[PDB]
Each structure stands twice: as structure tokens, then as C-alpha cells.
Amino acid sequence: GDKGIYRHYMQKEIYEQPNAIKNTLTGRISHGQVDLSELGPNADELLSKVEHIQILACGTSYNSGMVSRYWFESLAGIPCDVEIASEFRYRKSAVRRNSLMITLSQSGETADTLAGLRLSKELGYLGSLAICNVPGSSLVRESDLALMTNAGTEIGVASTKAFTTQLTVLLMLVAKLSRLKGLDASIEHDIVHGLQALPSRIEQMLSQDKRIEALAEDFSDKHHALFLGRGDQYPIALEGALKLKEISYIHAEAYAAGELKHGPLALIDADMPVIVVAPNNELLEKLKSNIEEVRARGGQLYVFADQDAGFVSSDNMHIIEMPHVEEVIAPIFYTVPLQLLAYHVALIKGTDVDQPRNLAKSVTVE
Amino acid sequence: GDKGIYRHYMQKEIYEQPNAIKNTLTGRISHGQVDLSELGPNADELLSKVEHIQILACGTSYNSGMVSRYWFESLAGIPCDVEIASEFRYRKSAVRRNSLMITLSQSGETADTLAGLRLSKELGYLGSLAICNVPGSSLVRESDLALMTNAGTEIGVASTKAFTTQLTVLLMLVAKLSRLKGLDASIEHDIVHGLQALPSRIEQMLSQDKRIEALAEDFSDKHHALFLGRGDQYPIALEGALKLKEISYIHAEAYAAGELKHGPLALIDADMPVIVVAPNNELLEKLKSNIEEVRARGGQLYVFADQDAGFVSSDNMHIIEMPHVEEVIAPIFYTVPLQLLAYHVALIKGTDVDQPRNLAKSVTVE
Numbered sequence A, B: 001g002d003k004g005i006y007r008h009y010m011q012k013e014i015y016e017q018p019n020a021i022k023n024t025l026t027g028r029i030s031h032g033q034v035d036l037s038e039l040g041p042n043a044d045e046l047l048s049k050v051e052h053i054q055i056l057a058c059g060t061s062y063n064s065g066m067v068s069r070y071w072f073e074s075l076a077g078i079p080c081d082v083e084i085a086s087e088f089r090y091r092k093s094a095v096r097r098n099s100l101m102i103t104l105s106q107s108g109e110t111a112d113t114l115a116g117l118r119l120s121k122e123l124g125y126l127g128s129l130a131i132c133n134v135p136g137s138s139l140v141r142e143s144d145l146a147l148m149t150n151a152g153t154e155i156g157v158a159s160t161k162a163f164t165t166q167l168t169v170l171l172m173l174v175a176k177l178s179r180l181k182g183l184d185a186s187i188e189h190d191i192v193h194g195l196q197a198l199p200s201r202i203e204q205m206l207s208q209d210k211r212i213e214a215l216a217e218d219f220s221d222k223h224h225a226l227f228l229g230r231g232d233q234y235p236i237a238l239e240g241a242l243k244l245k246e247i248s249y250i251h252a253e254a255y256a257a258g259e260l261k262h263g264p265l266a267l268i269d270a271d272m273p274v275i276v277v278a279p280n281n282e283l284l285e286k287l288k289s290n291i292e293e294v295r296a297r298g299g300q301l302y303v304f305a306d307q308d309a310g311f312v313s314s315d316n317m318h319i320i321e322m323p324h325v326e327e328v329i330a331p332i333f334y335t336v337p338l339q340l341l342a343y344h345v346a347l348i349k350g351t352d353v354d355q356p357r358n359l360a361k362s363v364t365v366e
Ligand SMILES: N[C@@H]1[C@@H](O)[C@H](O)[C@@H](COP(=O)(O)O)O[C@@H]1O
Pocket: A058, A059, A060, A061, A104, A105, A106, A107, A108, A109, A110, A113, A157, A158, A159, A359, A360, A361, A362, A363, B261, B262, B263
């Protein structure tokens, strides 16, 4: 494909996010409501019968499914389980009643994910839905239903727009299910308004790629990093650490923010910066208290946070202020600074951003 | 307490595992069947109504719950979800129908776990069961039912016998539920036979603390490690990496074995040994193929495996042969070499095994 003004496909793909998200919403928002009529005329009968959602995926696609679990449960009130596809395909699982199988895949060809879908056909699920970026791929062809992300081809080996568009489709599905369950109409309106505003917020943020370049300079010589997030931001911490592993080759590990004290705190020093993704005040107070315990070793927190929270930087706590955004789309929004941080560290180090060592665009063979 | 012949409480506690496990089984095996009559006369009516199990815990107690999920699903055919207690207490969850809430805690006082139990009382669970090592603790007092692990007091800040005894109680519960559900009696017999044989197998293994001392020498100068496991051994990989973080301060990270290619492979080199916990042949073939991709960087696999698998060491794949054991108790069995590996690295480095920097026996205050 053509990179145009971008140095790398992955860079182009990060900057395409606003347009990719706009494109994923196209035709699916009708009169302020999510319109998934592309699924056909029996889609709602199937979807209304759903009492549990099972999501299978690998790599970055597992991280978007993990965010969505918080949304399906807290917003649509539907039990949701998300699992690495290789874990699912090799174990004897207990299928839940009226369970919908959802696969997430940029390529639609990942061997483990495809194996999970094929296996599920014999396990008693209500049916399957493929959320994918490649039309006519195996996962799309073999699922009962498919919702394409419409992000355009993604050439970077590491997924960027495929992830945020997966999150966009997932959030539309949460909205549609909250309505099929006859839940408060505000749930869907909040989602629609958050989604429609998203492209322009990301565009805004993409223009402030300077505080990110500076943090990148701080991380470019580090060999370890700890990414922390709570709730729907924990999977964003997962994706941020995965991105730093993928293209900068730094040993970045994500962890639930509430578990820092249960192990990882013993590792922290000046060579292992701790990144916190969008904490509320109560959480940041606990984390600051934890970082104070490792002050003697130079432990530092780097916090991406809503400017409205009023956090103030200190010598070992650096607030990277972000514009206030709608809570419903916050996980999508906070992904972007972490993609850019990895990209900038990779640029500084001169690593192969588009084809990182030992990784593949899709693992299609066992 | 008294260490006797041991240098450290944690060392004593690792070596107490056979006796601790024997003690946890005491009074609960009657005529080849699990006897949980200590729960009272209404216990089985409650337990028979269970259609879903929710487990909450933190730290090492989350890892034992994670192993048990595989057992509840594959053996008792009961849907099981396990979550970090801080994640549970801060999110609006979708409670499943006829769900049993189980908390795992050595101390019975962890603030997040206790918060999760208290919150659950208002969320519609069928009831609660506390699996704990400290009698009369808050979690025990506030739960409907309690099964004590009976491991004796655990003084080491890092949990060892509390973890394997939690696994022992969990496996007895899996057996009891398979019987209440009228499943094949062999499930329970397998579990009982595996459990009754466990103390003596661990004792056997504890006598071969020499191949472990040698591997410890190989890891003592490393600053990174990747622990891999599939299925019921993935949580054992989690516990092994947690132990290395806890008492050796090495940046050890666990990962599902099927996800190595999806990111972490790019990090591997001579300074990041990869440990594989009890793989079958098909999995080891894939992992050997992955390690071959990083041969130029000196990537090496260290594999704890059943001698019966017939694996043979090569220059970049070191088989640490273990006696064949009953599959049902394999996760418990393979924990021991990983506890000893961390303990031996800690001994070499001279770190504070019993009171590792920045960690606490229990986080009882918010
Ligand atoms: N490098 C890619 C990742 O970016 C991707 O997340 C994963 C899953 O692929 P897919 O989403 O196509 O299923 O595969 C590879 O590891």
C-alpha cells in the first residue's frame, strides 16, 4: 500500500484511527440508535436469546475483547467471558446456557481463533459472530453472523486501527443488546454520542504528539516497564505493554492496578518506570502511596489522566494530562497515547516498526 | 514460630507441604470418597443448586483459583469464573444464575477479598464459601460456609503450603460437586487417589533438590524470565513467575504458552530464559520451533516435564525430567520445583526470603 506522508505503515495506521472509526460507524447509526440491520432479519431474534457471551481471540484481539467484557457486564448486564483462543481449544469447557460465541480477529485467519470457532460449533453455543477486518476470511465465512470493522487494510505487523475499530464495533453491540434487553435508552445514547465524538477527540489528541515524544525519550533506554490499569483500563494497560514489547523490545508487563502491592512492587526501581492508565483519585492515592514505598530506589509513576481530575506532578509522579472524554469511550481514547509512546520509542531506537523481529501479521499455521 | 532445621520459614513451609496436604485431607476422605460433612446438613442442598462458581482472591490465592477453574469446568462440568478481588469490587458485574461465591485467602483478612465478599452479599449469589488458612478470620466469619486448609501457620511473606493446600481443598470440592451432579464416579476416585498419593510424591521430589539448585545457578544472574504453561499449568506458570518476582526480584513474567508468538518472542535472548511447565509433545514441538526462531540471540527453553514423555535435551532446550504423576494433581506437583527454584535463586543472591522488600504477608488496609 501507500504510506503517503507517513514514515511507516504502523504510523499511518495510528493516524488513520479517526477516519477508520468514522468508517466503522458508517451505516450503523440511524436516528441516534445503533443499526445492525446488516446482520439480517433473524439477527435480533438470535441476539435477544443471548444470556452469556463468550469471546475468543489472540494477541491484540484478546485485549479488545477484554475491554468489552466490562462494557457487556456493566452496561448491557450480560455475563461475558473472554479467553485466549489456544486456551479454549485445548481444554474441556463448561458451555453456558444460551451463549453467543464471538471471535475477534483482524485477519480472520488466525489458526487458534479459527480452531476455537470450529470447536464451538459442536459445543452447544446459540451461534457465532465474527468481528473482523478482512472480508471473506475463514472466520467471517464460517461464523453465523459477521460485523466487519471497515478500518481499511492494516499492514503494520502490530495492530492499531484494527484494535480501536474492534472496540468501536464491540461498543455498538453493547448498545444494541442493551436495547434488545429493554434497558434504559440512555445507555445506548451515551454510547452513540461517545462514539460519534470519538474521531474528533482522537484527532485532537494526535496533534499533541510532543508530550508523548518526551516521555518516549524517558523510556527509550529502559529495559523494563510496568503498565497498570483498573477495570476497563486494565486491558488498555495490557495493550500498551504489548505494544512496547512488540516494537521497542522493552520488557513491558501489564498488571491489574490493585495487584501492584502483591508482587511487582518488589521489582520497581529507576529502571522500571510504572505507567498508570487513567486512574480515578482513590486509585491514584493508593498507587502514589505504593510508589512512595520504593522512593529509595527511584521508583516513578507516569500517569495518563483526565486534566479535570486535578492531579499535580511531583518528583516521582508525572501527570500526562489528557482532555476530559466520555467515560464510555475512555478505553478507546487512552489506547492512542500508548500506541504513540511505543511508536516514538521504536523510532528513537531505530527498530523495525512495521516488521518487528520474530513477529507475524497473523499466525495462520499450527 | 520454630524453624527447626530450616534456614528460613519459607523453606520450612515448602518442605512441610507433604504433611500440610496430609493434614488438609484428614477427616475429608471417607471410604474413598470426599467427605465435606463438616459444612453441615444443609451444605449439599446449597451445593447441589450451584450452576456457576465465582472465585475472588488476590496474589498467590488468585493463582490457585485460576488452576481450579480448569478442574471445575473439565471435571465437574460447572462454569467457573475467577477474578482479582480489586477488579471485582470496583466494577458493576453481571451475576450468573445460581452462582456460588468462593473466596480464597491464606489470611482471611485481605481488604480487597473481604470487600468482594461483603459486596457479593448484595448481588444475588446463592451463598459464600471461604477457603482459608486462618480460623476465625473475617472471611471465615462472614462467609456462609468455610473449608479451612489446615496447613499450620505460614510465616514466610510469600505463600507456599497455603497455595498447595488451597489447591487440595479446591480439588476435593470439584470431586464433591461431580458426585452431587451425579457424574461418573471415576472422577471422584481419580481425585481421591491422586490426592492420597500426593504427599509421598512431593516428598520424593523434595529429595531431588539438586537439579533445581543447578538451574537456580543458571537463573541467578538473569534479570528477566518468561514462564509458559497451557491449561491447568498456565496458572502454575503464573505462580512460578510470581515467586521469582517476590523473593529473587527478577523480572519474571508468566504468559499463556500459545501466546509466545503473539508478542513476547520478540524479547527473548540469552538474558531472558524461557521456562515451560509440563507441556505435552504437541505443545513442546511448537515451543521448540519458536525457540529456534531466536537461536541467533541465544534463546533457551528450560522444560519441567514428565520423564515418560521421552523429551531429549538439546543445546537450546533443557529437559528437567520429573516422575510421571497423576494428571489430576499435576498442577499441584509442578508448583514445587518452581517454589524451590525461586528459593534457591534467593539463597544464591542473599535476598530476604522471609520478608522480601516492599511486600506484606497480607494487605489488610485499603
Ligand atoms: N502481530 C499480530 C497481532 O497484531 C495480532 O493481534 C495477533 C492476532 O491476529 P488476528 O487479530 O488477526 O487474529 O496476531 C499477530 O500476533
